[PDB]
Design a binder for this molecule. Structure first.
Ligand code: SF4
Ligand code: SF4
Ligand code: SF4
Ligand code: FES
Ligand code: FES
Lengths: 688, 59, 164, 241, 239
């Protein structure tokens, strides 16, 4: 390369930077953190706040370091008298029209304007004129505006145009009367609309559900993971004692960059309603509060009095791996085999991890120049993943879709809508195959709605044939990806949480269980929980599954426990407890260990480390937290192995490949109890 | 300071420095110069006067 | 030339940490907890060694591992224990003695220093490496001049001109 | 709203393509220069200041006019001939803006002798600009005139960058207070400091064009501003006591 | 921003709401489609300012929400960009005005010549201030910055919206006194055509001046380009 790293001088120190880097990036590589208001790493460069002004030799004016490219042998000075005078003057211009609002503003304590004024500004003002006053704007139930505090950095406009894709904000007026918003009364309709509150450096845009409730210095922050979908976005939970006050994203470039959907950000208020805090046993009066010994004894009596073939265990969408392996080992120790998952396709073969995970990974998908989506709506399954797909679209990656046509906030080519179109694509009838055959690194993304189908094996065989013909998987590149929408599904597939052959046969001839264990399940089908059965519900919210149960055992939510979750790319991540257990609830694996002791066959582990070691004994990649293995690819041997499942239950070429998520804002028991999600739905209903 | 509000000309808090001296090994402490500047008679003794006030910087 | 925070008292703190004889002090495992004199069940609890990420609300980087050599950024944290409400007033009650001692007082320059402290005190620890920031921008909007490039809608076709 | 340079319009301009923006008068004189020769064009005016120029003379002038003339002509020659001179005689002159509105004014002493030239108005702490000449006489409130210029620059700010958008209104407020004399004497030095804070610190050159008339007013008529402040207390301090 | 438009956000009115309809006529649609062809097809958005001007004569001197939405659909761009352009520029009226839009320059070269006395004369005659419309719906008074007619200061521009797009007239009236602008307003009100340009000379040629904003005072002197025009000529481009 022709010296792809160039050398600059920052305060007489030599710094090597990549080519095309700005002056601000050279200052950052020298260990200097230049003040800024309009620059962002994820947005396009604007250059309008004038706070990043530094001095370059042989230039008589201050340059804007965010926008100015760095040339070879450049000499940058960041601490001369003109730089300090520039910083103080620009701060003084920023503060003359700002309202004296720090007591009533929610950014007070974590404000860029306050801290930068304290450090790089003066201590006085000389301004005694009247200020500019601006009326506030309505942008929906999630974003609160006090527009007198706007400093015209246009981060919101650039975000709405570039990442969210909706492009609904603009600057109206001219000069001092420039004004941010929508000209007409509109609602911010993006699923990623809470991120702009983080992007605003001031209290012009604040979070409406959070408003006036806390200051940032009072909050104990815990780094956890998000379980509202299958991506597992990295988050920080802020709590005051026993109460969670807000949820924010945190940086992870391999998973979520810096974003978080509105469901994962705003569903925390469902943790304050309908909570199970006591064990209950159903008596002649109904469910009534009982001791833990009594509730464990009743559950053990019902689990032991029934035959082993009349017991079924259903895992919920939010069950961690430790509780799932505990329930699996407890039910298998009694001679049962009927295991089911609330997220569907419980009879799916889980032999090779590459067949139900994203082999390209999330960050490795950016090296693809052509993407074919099969039967998925990524905007409602994972809006952060869809934002990364839009980022790929903006720098040249072409997108095609086989499925039901949906709004994706980027242009795509609709190849078809049914498996007949998939077969026509594999044969060669559609010209998109020649586009895939000439692509350097093609990618195929299969959504969870395909795997929920009754004919999923034939569709997966067609997808495998298409990948074989189009060079999707070859030497040096694996472009085959299967994504999920539930937090607990991949861990259950990893550990082997699946029904036995005898249990599948008994379901085929129509045997009905008498005892059902509901491990956090509230979206079960009626075929799996018969009426008149004995129901043991273990969970944290009182919902459909708890209103029907005979024994209720209160567990922990994901803000109260440290459980393992695996996302759809195969990465093992963990929650952390941000608040203690509520009431008389317990840890979720501990309930099953105590219940195995009361039944009469103890589980061989007595600690959290020991049940994690049992998980690592089943599949060794469980021990490597915050990392992803490279899964083995067995070419067409796996598809040859399951041809009996392709011959039975044949293909349905007329049923469209759709997405199963029909309610984005309410997908589980926590989001169904959230009043903010209900207001979000009501806002979209009252606009018609 | 009502109309002249610039701060970096009076930022005494952040303008102090600590500097690592060159390693004090092969220096030349001459005791002859130290004792040559000392008086030997009652007159020619010079005393450091007591400071009247601590620095106010004009305020 | 060498100038890495060379204008403050931290020069006089980096040395005095490398004074000979005192820079090689070492103890066996769990030995510092025996001589600490605090109850021995305190060391049955688990600790986390990690550097906290940047807050999403602000853009500054001073409390991150970017300035790790300048400022201690690694922390030791413990799991929460039970909390409840006071019946008379509603204040949050606790019985945890390690409720704020790791988050207020224990800060370290590196990961290995916090590990050494945990090892000599007897705490079992898990270490969490922080997520590394990426500085390279996207291909679109890489520089300021790509805002106005020909990648917006392609090269303009000159077919609507007069005389075509 | 202007773009930041770099990039430059000859590299990345209209529709991402190489582009040159030129003035009408620059474009129009080119065929005559190509037909009549460069040596004919450079025979007018001083060195590095070649050619002819259209001059617009407006304000307190007996015969306001758009007239073509050789460059490096004196102001007094350009006004007394071709325009009928200053209304009331040359001794009734107070100030002249020589280059539109974005350049600082000049008083009577500089104007008598200075040539209307690029390298002659610049050394007189002004500029040729567009060579638009605005003449004021001794009946003019020059603070009021520069205050209306400050109002213009407040009205015409595009609002993109912080110093122009916030400080043109501040300059207008301070100038409006100075016109009535409702100010303090050190607020004049504050006003100079605020113009120095705007100038050179913005995206485009409208911020400099907003700072420059106030700088010229302060520099050449600070005594008038001080007298306006002092004599306002002859009508404001009679109510305080 | 101009006069008469104190809001940079939309305010619902029975005349101006989302239910209001706008559509082009045949000839106006021909004009708009001819404007669009001046620009590349993939940069069709370049045509927004002339199209919005033509829409402003079509709608009767102002832009409604329906007109802006129609223009947004026509140029295949988001409506917020159209709202940005329409609120950014001074000529675009976003509230309903009168039939003739009277705009007076107030910048310093016109101000020295006595534009304030012309404003006083207009306000004493028509009975309205800047930013107002008469009770008859005839005249709307506005203020403008420098109009590039400073050697003929003080001047007024008057916009004609009584004939639609085909008969749109934007006429400068220059070198004015109170009597001249009163006569021009009376001539417009009576249905005649007042004379365009300067009221005491042809063009920017040397002649007298308005002294004190109340009286034209003619003055004789040297005038250039009084002889015969120059013949065609070219040097020898070879050597
Ligand atoms: S944004 Fe809010 S907290 Fe920050 S300086 Fe302004 S009023 Fe104070
Ligand atoms: S609302 Fe916030 S992000 Fe948007 S321009 Fe104003 S300060 Fe910037
Ligand atoms: S100096 Fe004024 S006109 Fe120029 S970019 Fe900045 S705000 Fe806009
Ligand atoms: S950060 Fe560069 S001008 Fe705002
Ligand atoms: S100042 Fe009125 S036309 Fe220029």
């Amino acid at each position: 390369p022709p010296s792809d790293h160039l050398e600059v001088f920052v305060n007489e120190q030599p710094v090597k930077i990549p080519k095309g880097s700005s002056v601000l990036q050279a200052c950052d590589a020298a260990g200097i953190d230049i003040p800024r208001f309009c620059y962002h790493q994820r947005l396009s460069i604007a250059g309008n706040c004038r706070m990043c002004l530094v001095e370059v030799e042989k230039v008589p004016k201050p340059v804007a370091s965010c926008a100015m490219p760095a040339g070879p042998g450049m000499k940058i000075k960041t601490e001369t008298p003109m730089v300090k005078k520039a910083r103080e003057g620009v701060m003084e211009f920023l503060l003359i029209n700002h309202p004296l609002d720090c007591p009533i503003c929610d950014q007070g304590g974590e404000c860029d304007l306050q801290d930068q004024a304290m450090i790089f500004g003066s201590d006085r003002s000389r301004f005694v004129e009247a200020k500019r006053a601006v009326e506030d704007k309505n942008l929906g139930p999630l974003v609160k505006t006090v527009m007198t505090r706007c400093i015209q950095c246009t981060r919101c406009v650039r975000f709405a145009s570039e990442v969210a894709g909706t492009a609904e904000l603009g600057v109206t007026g001219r000069g001092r009367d420039s004004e941010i918003g929508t000209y007409v009364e509109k609602l911010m309709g993006s699923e990623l609309s809470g991120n702009v509150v983080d992007l605003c450096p001031v209290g012009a845009l604040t979070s409406k559900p959070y408003a006036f409730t806390a200051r940032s210095w009072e909050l104990k922050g815990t780094e956890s993971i998000d379980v509202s979908d299958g991506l597992g976005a990295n988050i920080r939970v802020d709590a005051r004692g026993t109460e969670v006050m807000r949820i924010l994203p945190r940086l992870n470039e391999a998973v979520n960059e810096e974003w978080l959907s509105d469901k994962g950000r705003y569903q925390y208020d469902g943790l304050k309603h309908q909570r199970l805090d006591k064990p209950m046993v159903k008596g002649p009066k109904g469910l009534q509060v009982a001791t833990w010994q009594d509730a464990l004894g009743a559950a053990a009596a019902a689990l032991t009095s029934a035959a082993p073939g009349e017991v079924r265990g259903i895992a919920g969408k939010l069950a961690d791996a430790e509780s799932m392996v505990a329930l699996m080992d407890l039910l298998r120790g009694l001679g049962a085999g009927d295991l089911a998952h609330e997220g569907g396709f419980s009879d799916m073969p889980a032999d090779v991890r590459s067949t139900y995970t994203a082999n390209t990974t999330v960050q490795g998908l950016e090296q693809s120049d052509l993407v074919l989506l099969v039967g998925t709506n990524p905007r409602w399954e994972s809006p952060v993943f869809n934002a990364r797909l839009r980022k790929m679209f903006l720098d040249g990656t072409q997108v095609g879709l086989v499925g039901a046509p949906v709004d994706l906030t980027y242009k795509y080519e609709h190849v078809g809508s049914d498996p007949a179109a998939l077969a026509a694509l594999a044969a060669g009838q559609h010209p998109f195959l020649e586009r895939l055959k000439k692509a350097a690194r093609p990618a195929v993304v299969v959504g969870p709605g395909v795997l929920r189908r009754a004919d999923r094996e034939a569709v997966m065989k067609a997808v495998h044939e298409l990948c074989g013909k189009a060079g999707v998987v070859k030497e040096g590149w694996n472009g085959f990806n299967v994504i999920h929408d539930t937090a607990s599904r991949v861990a259950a597939l990893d550990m082997g949480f699946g029904p036995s052959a005898a249990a599948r046969a008994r379901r085929a001839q129509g045997a009905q269980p008498k005892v059902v264990y509901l491990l956090g399940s509230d979206d079960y089908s009626e075929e799996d929980v018969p009426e008149g059965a004995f129901v043991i519900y273990q969970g944290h919210h009182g919902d459909r599954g708890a209103s029907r149960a005979n024994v209720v055992l209160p567990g922990a939510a994901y803000t109260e426990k440290s459980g393992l979750y695996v996302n759809f790319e195969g990465r093992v991540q963990q929650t952390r407890a941000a608040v203690p257990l509520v009431g008389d609830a317990r840890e979720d694996w501990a309930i099953l260990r105590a219940l195995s002791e009361v039944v009469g066959k103890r589980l061989p582990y007595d600690s959290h480390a020991a049940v994690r070691a049992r998980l690592a004994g089943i599949a060794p990649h469980f021990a490597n937290i915050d990392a992803v293995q490279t899964p083995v690819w067995l070419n067409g041997e796996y598809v040859k192995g399951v041809e009996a499942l392709a011959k039975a239950a044949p293909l349905q070429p007329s049923a469209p490949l759709t997405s199963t998520i029909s309610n984005f804002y309410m997908t589980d028991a926590i989001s169904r109890a959230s009043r903010t999600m209900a207001k979000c739905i009501q806002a979209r209903q009252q606009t018609k | 300071l009502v109309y002249d509000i610039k701060y970096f000309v009076r930022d005494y808090r952040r303008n102090n420095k600590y500097t690592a001296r060159t390693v004090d090994a092969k220096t030349t402490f001459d005791f002859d110069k130290l004792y040559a500047g000392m008086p030997t008679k009652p007159e020619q003794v010079k005393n450091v006067t007591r400071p009247l006030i601590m620095p106010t910087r004009g305020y | 030339e060498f100038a890495t925070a060379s204008a403050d008292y931290s020069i006089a703190m980096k040395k005095a940490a490398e004074i000979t004889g005192a820079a090689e002090s070492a103890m066996g495992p769990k030995e510092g907890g025996f001589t600490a004199g605090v109850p021995l069940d305190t060391f049955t609890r688990k600790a986390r060694i990690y550097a906290p990420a940047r807050t999403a609300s602000q853009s500054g980087l001073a409390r991150t591992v970017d300035f790790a050599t300048t400022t201690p950024a690694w922390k030791i944290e413990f799991e929460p224990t039970a909390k409840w409400q006071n019946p008379l007033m509603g204040w949050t009650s606790s019985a945890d003695p390690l409720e704020n001692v790791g988050r207020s007082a224990l800060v370290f320059y590196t990961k290995e220093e916090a590990m050494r402290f945990c090892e000599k005190l007897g705490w079992e620890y898990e270490v969490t490496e922080p997520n590394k920031r990426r500085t390279q921008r996207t291909k679109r909007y890489m520089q300021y001049g790509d805002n106005f490039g020909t990648k917006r809608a392609g090269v303009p076709d000159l077919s609507t001109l007069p005389s075509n | 709203k202007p773009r930041l340079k770099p990039p430059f319009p000859a590299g990345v301009g209209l529709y991402g393509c190489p582009t040159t923006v030129t003035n009408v008068e620059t474009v129009a004189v080119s065929p005559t220069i190509l037909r009549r020769g460069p040596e004919w064009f450079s025979s007018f005016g001083r060195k590095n200041n070649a050619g002819t120029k259209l001059f617009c003379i407006s304000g307190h002038v007996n015969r306001p006019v758009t007239v073509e003339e050789e460059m490096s002509i004196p102001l007094k020659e350009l006004i007394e001939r071709h325009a009928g001179g200053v209304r009331g005689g040359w001794d009734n002159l107070l100030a002249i803006i020589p280059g539109g509105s974005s350049v600082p004014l000049l008083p009577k002493k500089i104007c008598d002798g200075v040539l209307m030239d690029f390298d002659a108005l610049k050394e007189a702490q002004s500029g040729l600009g567009t060579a638009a000449v605005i003449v004021m006489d001794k009946s003019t409130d020059v603070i009021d005139a520069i205050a209306r210029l400050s109002y213009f620059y407040k009205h015409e700010s595009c609002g993109q960058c912080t110093p122009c958008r916030e400080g043109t209104g501040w300059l207008y407020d301070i100038m409006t207070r100075m016109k009535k004399g409702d100010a303090r004497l050190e607020e004049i030095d504050m006003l100079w400091e605020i113009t120095k804070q705007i100038e050179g610190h913005t995206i485009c050159a409208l911020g400099d064009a907003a700072a420059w008339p106030v700088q010229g007013l302060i520099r050449h008529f600070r005594g008038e501003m001080e007298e306006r402040i002092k004599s306002a207390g002859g009508k404001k301090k009679l109510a305080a006591t | 921003t101009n006069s008469t438009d104190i809001f940079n956000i939309h305010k619902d009115t029975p005349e101006n709401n989302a239910a209001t309809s706008f559509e082009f006529s045949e000839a106006t649609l021909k004009v708009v489609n001819d404007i669009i062809a001046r620009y590349p097809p993939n940069y069709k958005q370049s045509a927004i300012i002339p199209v919005l001007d033509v829409t402003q004569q079509e709608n009767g001197g102002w832009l409604s929400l329906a007109a802006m939405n129609r223009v947004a659909k026509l140029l295949d761009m988001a409506p917020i960009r159209v709202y940005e352009v329409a609120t950014f520029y001074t000529m675009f009226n976003r509230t309903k005005i009168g039939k003739y839009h009277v705009q007076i320059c107030g910048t310093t070269p016109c101000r020295l010549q006595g534009s304030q006395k012309i404003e006083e004369a207009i306000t004493k005659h028509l009975g309205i201030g800047i930013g107002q419309t008469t009770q008859d719906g005839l005249f709307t008074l506005g203020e403008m910055e420098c109009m590039g007619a400073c050697v003929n200061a003080p001047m007024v521009a008057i916009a004609d919206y009584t004939k639609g797009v085909s008969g749109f007239e934007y006429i400068y009236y220059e070198d004015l006194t109170p009597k001249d602008i009163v006569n021009i307003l009376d001539t417009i009100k009576k249905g005649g055509k007042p004379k365009p340009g300067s009221q005491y000379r042809l063009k920017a040629e040397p002649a007298g001046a308005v002294h004190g904003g109340e009286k034209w005072v003619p003055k004789d002197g040297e005038t250039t380009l009084t002889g015969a025009p120059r013949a065609p000529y070219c040097r020898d481009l070879n050597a």
